Amino acid sequence: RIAGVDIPRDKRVVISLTYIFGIGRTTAQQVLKEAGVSEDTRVRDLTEEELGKIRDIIDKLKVEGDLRREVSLNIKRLIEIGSYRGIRHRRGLPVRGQNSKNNARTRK
Amino acid sequence: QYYGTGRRKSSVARVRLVPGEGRIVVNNREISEHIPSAALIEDIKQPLTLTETAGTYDVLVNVHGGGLSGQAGAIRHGIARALLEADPEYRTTLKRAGLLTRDARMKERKKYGLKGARRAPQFSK
Amino acid sequence: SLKKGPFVDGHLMTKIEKLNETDKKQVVKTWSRRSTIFPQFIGHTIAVYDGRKHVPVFISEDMVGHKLGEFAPTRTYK
Amino acid sequence: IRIRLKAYDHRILDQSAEKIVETAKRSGASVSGPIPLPTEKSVYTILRAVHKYKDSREQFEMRTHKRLIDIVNPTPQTVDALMRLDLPSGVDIEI
Amino acid sequence: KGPVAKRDVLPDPIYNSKLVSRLINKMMIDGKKGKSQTILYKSFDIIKERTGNDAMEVFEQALKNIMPVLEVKARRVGGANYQVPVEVRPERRTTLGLRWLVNYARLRGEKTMEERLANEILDAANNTGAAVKKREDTHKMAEANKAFA
Amino acid sequence: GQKVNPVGLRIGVIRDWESKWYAGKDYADFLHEDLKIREYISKRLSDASVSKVEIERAANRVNITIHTAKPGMVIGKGGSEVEALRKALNSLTGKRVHINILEIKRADLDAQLVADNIARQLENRVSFRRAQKQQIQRTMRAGAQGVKTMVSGRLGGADIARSEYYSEGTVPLHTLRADIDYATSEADTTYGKLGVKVWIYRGEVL
Amino acid sequence: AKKSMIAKQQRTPKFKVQEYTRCERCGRPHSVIRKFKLCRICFRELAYKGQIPGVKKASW
RNA sequence: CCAGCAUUCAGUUGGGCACUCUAAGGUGACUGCCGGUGACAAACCGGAGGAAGGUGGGGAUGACGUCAAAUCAUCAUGCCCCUUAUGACCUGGGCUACACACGUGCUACAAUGGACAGAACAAAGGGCAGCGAAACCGCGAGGUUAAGCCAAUCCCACAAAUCUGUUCUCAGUUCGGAUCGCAGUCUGCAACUCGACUGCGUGAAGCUGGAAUCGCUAGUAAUCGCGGAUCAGCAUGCCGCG
């Protein structure tokens, strides 16, 4: 697959492409705005000239590994420079600014 | 040419009966144009159906305020009182079928300390 | 903030321009946790007040975009 | 010509109602009726206890009702009469 | 105290009955008439079609395989857990049939309740059905506990 | 939680206001300038036994009606005492203050001054026994269809504080046609701080 | 801290955000009303002596 | 407010006090009256008329006292205690910590749903350094300038659920929306601890919850939005409204 990980062949055009890491719903709409494929066809049933225009737009964006690097780069950045928000990423506690006596069960 | 007013659940209806054929026009809109759910379409027609007044009077409607079932609910009182003006004979037939009450079930006010005007919030022990 | 520039206090901009003009020198007890970090601050060590002491911290080429309040542990835990 | 009365008490206002109307009628000013208007009112809610008892409230409501006066003709004899009007200050006449 | 009855609204646009509107008052999740009415009139159109009959004669004949004869009330003496046979009023035959309709209808599991309710009625018209045994097991509770009155 | 103060339960329906004007742009700062008036006039004229004050904001005029039951302590010469009043208040307000004084007939029927006389006798070291029953017979012989007095607190004793009735006649707190004067007044004693609740039923309206 | 807390509100603070509310009769924060500049308890006992010209009991 | 009367993109221009509505004064319901009941009394049962029938629905109103129930931290406060400090002022921190239990609240675990589009419908409250239209620009939160409004005139404010199409097809998914990254906007001296809200991404836990418990007699149960106090700023909070 273009992302290196598949889309299911029977879903619609927008939502199958949202399984691509880094690509959500509104990122899919900007691509298909440039593609112009009406967004409701079987993605088992396309042409490659149609899908070659799908490829190079994905080639233009931070999609597969690059978006996996740079946030993990930022995690490795801010922890190793102190930077208290680094410690909240570090210990297993919330980051964005919350209390602590309450639930916070996404991180312990 | 008979006239009436209609009030039910905080909304105002003005009903006047010109001699026509049964067409009901709601502030230059129609019934299905303005009110879906044909349950209420036979319900707004209920004062028209008991007395033999089927295809003989067109209705001008001034719906003001409120929501749809309260709006249409105001008309099904206002149709009656406007058609009370025609003949007071069948008033006794209508009054035994209700339809003249102006239902006093206004939405009650929220108490302080209670959520939904009768609901106590919760309880512990 | 968005477009007013990164916020500094007048005393912070004063002594660091006295620091940058000649030579890097002793640490500075700031009471301005609130202030940002400018790219001129790199290599300047300063003392941030934590609530009960001024903790000395370092500024490098990576600790640039944030404020000074990222380096003030005010709530110690175990 | 637009004159608006807005007060707190229905006893004072209705007593002060014809004080403008009938006296301006004496010089023939063609004054409209004392038209009422909806009451801009307000609700204050305050805990009845000193310290505890958030769920036991003590509501207080402030009502300011108002009635309207319009005059068609100028009639400058009434302008001297409207200037010399002497009322209890709860009504706060404004022209 | 004493007996206190409540009110009800007569008509029906289609299938001009009284008890059908009581079923419209059933499955009214959170105050939605027409959202349940959209479920209802689409169902009976299939019921008129999928079985080539008038849906009224399908409806109450299915109800007769649901409408019970005996309730069971109780009696606690120590820990004996006694039961009481109860004659079901002609009020309660109308009411408790609707509960045993709609609860098991939405619990079966298909695409929409347009399809859940429609095949449930045929499972009570042709009375081989899951909700029909709910009537039957109460008789099995009534047949054992008959001895008391 | 005990009985609601029956003045404010009757204010507006039967009993008129005291503060009377209309709110424009300054309705907070009308009150502060007027609450300083009532604290000033109760300061200097507590000895003069001034009961109640009504205030009119009268378009750069301040009209104060005064209820006392004697002018002879309050006007003095007639010109002497009232000029010291208006000179102080015009300095306190910053604008004109017009002063009029109304005498109260039957001084043993006004709740602000009937309760005040008890607190004078308590600070003069008189026990409650002779206190309340003398006060009630003043009110009953003056004409009153019901009088309820109550002094609550330490009785000059050591610790065990308690409320104490003495009342006669009809006190209809829940007939909404009342005309009931109600006021309280504190008392500074040697063994603490006595409170006095006194309210008088005068007769309802038909 | 009472009379300084009356005084600090009646001074000029370092910034206009550091204005707060205080009722000037029983001076405490936590609900001084903006319209009256009066406190939560001090609204009530002053209402029951014929004062605060508008407010009566509430029932509708 | 708009029926009749034309003019109108439009109650707009006229014009009008009908109707609606506004708010002052009456009026009406009292077991008054009919029948039956018991005693014939009170009162009960039924019927009539009537907008309304048995204290019409609701509010406000809470007897004597109970618990030495609550508040010296609203105030007042006797007594005790403090005083170059237990008083006053400033910065900054903290009241927001978190291995873990508990109440109390919302958003959900979906097909009565999700997504998009169309159509239509409220009540009450608020606005002077206060609301800010329209307009333009930003994907947007908004920015820009700015009419009008001290207000039934102008603005907040285009209500949501609803209805009708389209698409979705039963799975941890087109449900979920936390958690978290980056990019932003506002207010304010200043948003790091410690604000709200968008924009992009990320997409867990959970697929009706054990013993046990809680609310509710008719516009209530649940459900959906909106207004306001409080405030520079901030609500799943509480009032209040349909």
Swiss-Prot record, chain C:
GO molecular function: rRNA binding; structural constituent of ribosome
Keyword Cell inner membrane recorded: no
Cysteine pairings via disulfide bonds: none
GO cellular component: cytoplasm; small ribosomal subunit
Source organism superkingdom: Bacteria
Keywords carried by this UniProt record: Ribonucleoprotein, Ribosomal protein, RNA-binding, rRNA-binding
Biological process terms in GO annotation: ribosomal small subunit assembly; translation
Family in the record: Belongs to the universal ribosomal protein uS19 family.
Subunit organization: Part of the 30S ribosomal subunit.
Function noted in UniProt: Protein S19 forms a complex with S13 that binds strongly to the 16S ribosomal RNA.
Protein name in UniProt: Small ribosomal subunit protein uS19
Protein source organism: Bacillus subtilis (strain 168)
UniProtKB/Swiss-Prot annotation, chain D:
InterPro entries: Ribosomal_uS10 (IPR001848), Ribosomal_uS10_CS (IPR018268), Ribosomal_uS10_dom (IPR027486), Ribosomal_uS10_dom_sf (IPR036838)
GO molecular function: structural constituent of ribosome; tRNA binding
Record key words, sorted: Ribonucleoprotein, Ribosomal protein
Gene that encodes the chain: rpsJ
GO CC, one annotated term: small ribosomal subunit
Name this polypeptide is given: Small ribosomal subunit protein uS10
Oligomeric form and interacting partners: Part of the 30S ribosomal subunit.
BP GO terms, sorted: translation
Ribosomal protein found in the keyword field: yes
Function according to Swiss-Prot or TrEMBL: Involved in the binding of tRNA to the ribosomes.
Family named by the database record: Belongs to the universal ribosomal protein uS10 family.
Record Pfam families: Ribosomal_S10
Swiss-Prot record, chain E:
SUPFAM superfamilies per record: Ribosomal protein S7 (SSF47973)
Assigned GO CC terms: cytosolic small ribosomal subunit; ribosome
Pfam families xref list: Ribosomal_S7
InterPro entries from the UniProt entry: Ribosomal_uS7, Ribosomal_uS7_bac/org-type, Ribosomal_uS7_CS, Ribosomal_uS7_dom, Ribosomal_uS7_dom_sf
Keyword Ribosomal protein: yes
Any one GO molecular function term: rRNA binding
Top-rank lineage group of the source organism: Bacteria
Keyword terms: Ribonucleoprotein, Ribosomal protein, RNA-binding, rRNA-binding, tRNA-binding
Example GO BP: translation
Family that this chain belongs to: Belongs to the universal ribosomal protein uS7 family.
The protein's assembly and partners: Part of the 30S ribosomal subunit. Contacts proteins S9 and S11. Interacts with VmlR.
Function comment: One of the primary rRNA binding proteins, it binds directly to 16S rRNA where it nucleates assembly of the head domain of the 30S subunit. Is located at the subunit interface close to the decoding center, probably blocks exit of the E-site tRNA.
Name this polypeptide is given: Small ribosomal subunit protein uS7
Upper classification of the organism: Bacteria, Bacillati, Bacillota, Bacilli, Bacillales
UniProtKB/Swiss-Prot annotation, chain F:
Keywords assigned by UniProt, alphabetized: Ribonucleoprotein, Ribosomal protein, RNA-binding, rRNA-binding
InterPro entries attached to this UniProt entry: KH_dom, KH_dom-like_a/b, KH_dom_type_2, KH_sf_prok-type, Ribosomal_S3_C_sf, Ribosomal_uS3_bac-typ, Ribosomal_uS3_C, Ribosomal_uS3_CS
Pfam families noted in UniProt: KH_2, Ribosomal_S3_C
GO CC term (a single one): cytosolic small ribosomal subunit
GO molecular function: mRNA binding; rRNA binding; structural constituent of ribosome
GO biological process: translation
Keyword Transmembrane helix belongs to the record: no
Gene3D superfamilies xref list: 3.30.300.20, Ribosomal protein S3, C-terminal domain (3.30.1140.32)
Chain ranges of the KH type-2 domain: 37-105
Subunit-level organization: Part of the 30S ribosomal subunit. Forms a tight complex with proteins S10 and S14.
Function: Binds the lower part of the 30S subunit head. Binds mRNA in the 70S ribosome, positioning it for translation.
Family, per entry: Belongs to the universal ribosomal protein uS3 family.
Protein name (Swiss-Prot/TrEMBL): Small ribosomal subunit protein uS3
Species this chain originates from: Bacillus subtilis (strain 168)
